[PDB]
Amino acid sequence: IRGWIFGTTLDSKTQSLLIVNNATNVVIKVCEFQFCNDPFLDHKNNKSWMESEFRVYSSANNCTFEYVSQPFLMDLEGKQGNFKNLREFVFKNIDGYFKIYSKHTPILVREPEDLPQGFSALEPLVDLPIGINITRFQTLLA
Amino acid sequence: QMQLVQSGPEVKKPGTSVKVSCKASGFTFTDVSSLQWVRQARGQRLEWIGWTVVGTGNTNYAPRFQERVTITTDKSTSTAYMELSSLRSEDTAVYYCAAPFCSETSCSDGFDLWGQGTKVTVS
Amino acid sequence: KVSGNYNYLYRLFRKSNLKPFERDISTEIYQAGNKPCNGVAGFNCYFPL
Amino acid sequence: RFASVYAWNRKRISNCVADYSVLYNLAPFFTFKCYGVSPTKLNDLCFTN
Amino acid sequence: EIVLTQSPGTLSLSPGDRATLSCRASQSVRISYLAWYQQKPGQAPRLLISGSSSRATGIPDRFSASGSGTDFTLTISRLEPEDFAVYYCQQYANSPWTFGQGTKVEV
Ligand SMILES: *[C@@H]1O[C@H](CO)[C@@H](O[C@@H]2O[C@H](CO)[C@@H](O)[C@H](O)[C@H]2NC(C)=O)[C@H](O)[C@H]1NC(C)=O
Ligand SMILES: *[C@@H]1O[C@H](CO)[C@@H](O)[C@H](O)[C@H]1NC(C)=O
Ligand SMILES: *[C@@H]1O[C@H](CO)[C@@H](O)[C@H](O)[C@H]1NC(C)=O
């Protein structure tokens, strides 16, 4: 899973959003840019990571907010087996504000489904003044 | 009831100006209602003149009446005016304004309200 | 201006009221009747600005 | 120039010292009234954003 | 500029039967932007059928509209003596609107 990109009506003429984390970064950014139907990011060379066609922004009309924040805890390389990392998010949309709460847990040694038991609490992460309703946002998978 | 009323017949000399207006009783034009104007002669067919949108204010005119007739709408009294100049002998006919009822949400795709028209003659 | 400034716009028709702080513009064609307006405008199909 | 009504722009103010003395003394302010605060008590408060 | 032609020019059928009239255009046509009107002598015309399925206030079930292509038709199940009037076809979709020419129905 990659990061936050979402716009309203798919017409290249609407003030979309970009909470983008490509390599080691996050830049919060609110501006008008074109979104394709399926702008893909990484599908290249069977199973090796390359930023191919990653760009999803072409034309600017009005940029409002830009800010810097570090990316969420990610690791290197990908393979099948040894399910260890457990990343939990809760997304909420209230009164023109997008709120994300996040939590990360290591050494979750539980292979066959069965979300582990126990108790953990999610600290708040960021608050965004998006200004739109959401039945439509997306964080694409590589 | 909710209905549209029209003015009375009149006789006007040629080469002059004519004003026509039709009223609405118990009925408001809000922002979506539109209306058209038609003319009927004696023993003839019906010819369409123009229709305007109350909200946007866009107006449409027949090509042969591009300068002859001017159509305007009024929100305060929710009505429609026409101004014409230099009327001829063929203008002696009955004028009607037709609109569909519409209340800020949606409305029928046909003109069901109608007036009784003004009989305008030139002598 | 004497000639009239026409670069300020505001919406006229909308199906539903907007909740507080909703901003993202949209310029589609608002239909009035039950007939589905598509693309260009006409009878019961009006530009909303 | 200000943006149109249907496309209002919201700007974020942060990391600064807010002086409302410059704002209050402008002559043509024919509408200035507040709800959760009072106009004369904005010079000794701190806001999150 | 689209021209609407109605047929037949006149209709002479006894009351108590089914009647049929047609109107055709030249340019492209749309199913629900064509309407049929009737005009009593001395009275302003009133809406009868539009959209081939919609009806005005108090329209009896006898009225029916048929056709999907350029040619459209009006069918009347059961005629009554004062139904005799002139019928007009009106179009919306195309360039500045034009009416028909009128068809007189009689005994
Ligand atoms: C979700 O929110 C958007 C943004 O407010 C809504 O977009 C508005 O929709 C109305 C009707 O479609 C338009 O006339 C407005 O112009 C749009 N807003 C702006 C600022 O232009 C959208 O309709 C909402 N969706 C739902 C299902 O409620
Ligand atoms: C993150 O964004 C910055 C801003 O342009 C850019 O310089 C940097 O290369 C980006 N990170 C990656 C891994 O591309
Ligand atoms: C990797 O992708 C590039 C272009 O996307 C292609 O030229 C190259 O042949 C690919 N290599 C493999 C091993 O698939």
What's the rounded Cα separation, in Å, for the pair A23 and A71? 8
SS3 of E74-86: EEECCCCHHHCCE
What's the rounded Cα separation, in Å, for the pair A128 and A135? 16
> Which CB contacts under 8 angstroms, 24+ apart, belong to E79-82?
E79/E13, E79/E15, E79/E16, E79/E17, E79/E19, E79/E105, E80/E15, E81/E15, E82/E40
Contact E45, E38 (CB under 8 A): yes
| CATH number of the domain that residue E81 is part of | 2.60.40.10
- DSSP-derived pairing of the beta strands C30-31 and B46-53: unpaired
CA angle, corner B51, sides to B45 and B57, nearest 5? 170
Q: What residue numbers bound the domain in which E66 lies?
A: 5-105
Asked if E93 and C42 come within 8 Å (Cβ–Cβ), the reply is: yes
DSSP readout, B6-21?
E---EEE-TTSEEEEE
- What are C33's two structure tokens? 């009747």
- What are E95's two structure tokens? 């360039």
Contact B102, B30 (CB under 8 A): yes
Minimal-distance CA residue of chain C relative to D5: C10
Tell me, what amino acid is at E51?
A: G
Contact B87, B122 (CB under 8 A): yes
Cα(A24) to centroid of ligand 3, in Å? 24
What's the rounded Cα separation, in Å, for the pair B38 and B95? 6
Residues in a beta bridge with B11: B121
Exposed (0-12), middle (13-18) or buried (19+): which is E75, by Cβ within 10 Å?
A: middle
**What distance separates the 2 farthest-apart alpha carbons in chain E?**
39
- Is the alpha carbon torsion for E26, E30, E31, E34 positive or negative? negative
What's the rounded Cα separation, in Å, for the pair D29 and B122? 59
DSSP readout, chain B?
--EEEE---EEE-TTSEEEEEEEEES---TTT-EEEEEEE-TT--EEEEEEEETTT--B---GGGTTTEEEEEETTTTEEEEEEES--GGG-EEEEEE-----SS---SS-------EEEEE-
Q: Please give the resolution of this entry in Å, rounded to 1 decimal.
A: 3.3
Closest CA to C43 of E31, C32, C12, C34: C32
The distance in angstroms from the start CA to the end CA of chain A is: 6
What's the rounded Cα separation, in Å, for the pair B10 and B82? 14
SS3 of A101-139: EEEEECCCCCCCCCCCCCCCCCEEEEEECCCCCCCCCEC
- What are E90's two structure tokens? 């009106």
- Contacts for A94 with CB less than 8 Å, ≥ 6 apart: none
- Contacts for B116 with CB less than 8 Å, ≥ 6 apart: B5, B6, B96, E43, E44
CA angle, corner E6, sides to B38 and C45, nearest 5? 50
C/D interface, count of CB pairs below 8 Å: 18
| Chain centroid, CA A2 distance in Å | 5
Q: How many CB atoms lie within 10 A of CB C37?
A: 17
What's the rounded Cα separation, in Å, for the pair A59 and A31? 10
CB within 8 Å of chain A, chain D residues 1-49? 7, 9-12
Asked if B32 and C33 come within 8 Å (Cβ–Cβ), the reply is: no
Exposed (0-12), middle (13-18) or buried (19+): which is E93, by Cβ within 10 Å?
A: middle
Closest CA to C23 of B22, A7, E57, A56: A7
Asked if C42 and E32 come within 8 Å (Cβ–Cβ), the reply is: no
Q: How many CB atoms lie within 10 A of CB A84?
A: 12
Half-sphere exposure of A57 (CA within 13 A, CB side): 19
Closest CA to C44 of B50, B32, B36, E95: B32
Torsional class of A96: left (φ above 0), alpha (ψ -120 to 50), beta (otherwise): left
- Residue D21 φ then ψ, to 5°: -65, -40
Indicate the length of chain E as a whole number. Answer: 107
- Contacts for E9 with CB less than 8 Å, ≥ 6 apart: E103, E104
Q: Which residues of A touch C26 (CB under 8 A)?
A: 8-9, 14
Asked if C8 and D6 come within 8 Å (Cβ–Cβ), the reply is: no
User: Domains, chain B, ranges and CATH?
Assistant: 3-122 (2.60.40.10)
What's the rounded Cα separation, in Å, for the pair A67 and A27? 6
What's the rounded Cα separation, in Å, for the pair B30 and B54? 8
The atom of ligand 3 lying closest to the CA of A46 is: 14
| Protein residues whose CB sits closer than 6 Å to any atom of ligand 2 | A 22-25, 27
Q: Which residues of B touch C32 (CB under 8 A)?
A: 32, 102, 106-107
- DSSP-derived pairing of the beta strands B118-122 and B10-12: parallel
Number of domains in chain E: 1
Nearest residue (by CA) to ligand 1, atom 17, is C26
What's the rounded Cα separation, in Å, for the pair D21 and D42? 10
| Protein residues whose CB sits closer than 6 Å to any atom of ligand 3 | A 44-46, 52
Distances in Å between the Cα of A75 and the Cα atoms of A1, A25, A84, A113, C35 are: 12, 14, 11, 22, 54
What's the rounded Cα separation, in Å, for the pair B44 and E102? 9
What's the rounded Cα separation, in Å, for the pair A19 and A130? 11
Asked if A131 and D9 come within 8 Å (Cβ–Cβ), the reply is: no
Q: Does B96 touch chain E (CB under 8 A)?
A: yes
Q: How was this structure determined?
A: cryo-EM
DSSP readout, A4-56?
EEE-SSSSS-SEEEEEE-SSS--EEEEEE----SS--S---TTTS----S---
Closest CA to E49 of E61, E72, E62, E65: E65
B/C interface, count of CB pairs below 8 Å: 26
- DSSP-derived pairing of the beta strands E103-106 and E10-12: parallel
Closest CA to C33 of E54, B61, B54, B71: E54
Closest CA to E23 of E41, E40, E9: E9
Mutate to test the pocket of ligand 2, among A21, A25, A49, A51 (most ligand atoms within 8 A of CB): A25
Q: Does C49 touch chain D (CB under 8 A)?
A: yes
- DSSP-derived pairing of the beta strands E46-50 and E54-55: antiparallel
| Chain centroid, CA E11 distance in Å | 13
Residues in a beta bridge with E36: E49, E89
Radius of gyration, alpha carbons of chain E? 13
DSSP readout, D4-48?
-GGG-------SS----HHHHT-TT------SSS-GGGSTT----
C35 lines ligand 1 (CB under 6 A): no
What's the rounded Cα separation, in Å, for the pair E12 and A29? 75
> Helix (H, G, I), strand (E, B), or coil: what is residue E4?
coil
Considering only CB atoms, D11 lies closest to which of A15, A64, A131, namely: A64
The distance in angstroms from the start CA to the end CA of chain B is: 36
Contact E5, E88 (CB under 8 A): no
Burial B105-121 (b: 16+ CB within 10 A, else e): eebbbbbbbbbbbbbbe
Q: Which residues of D touch A28 (CB under 8 A)?
A: none
What's the rounded Cα separation, in Å, for the pair E75 and E79? 10
Give chain E's count of helices (H) and strands (E).
0, 10
Indicate the length of chain A as a whole number. Answer: 142
Asked if A8 and C27 come within 8 Å (Cβ–Cβ), the reply is: no
Please name which ligand lies nearest the alpha carbon of A21. 2
What's the rounded Cα separation, in Å, for the pair E23 and E74? 8
Q: Which residues of D touch C11 (CB under 8 A)?
A: 5-6
Distances in Å between the Cα of B15 and the Cα atoms of A92, B10, B64, E73, E107 are: 71, 15, 18, 44, 45
Closest CA to B48 of E48, E104, E91, E38: E91
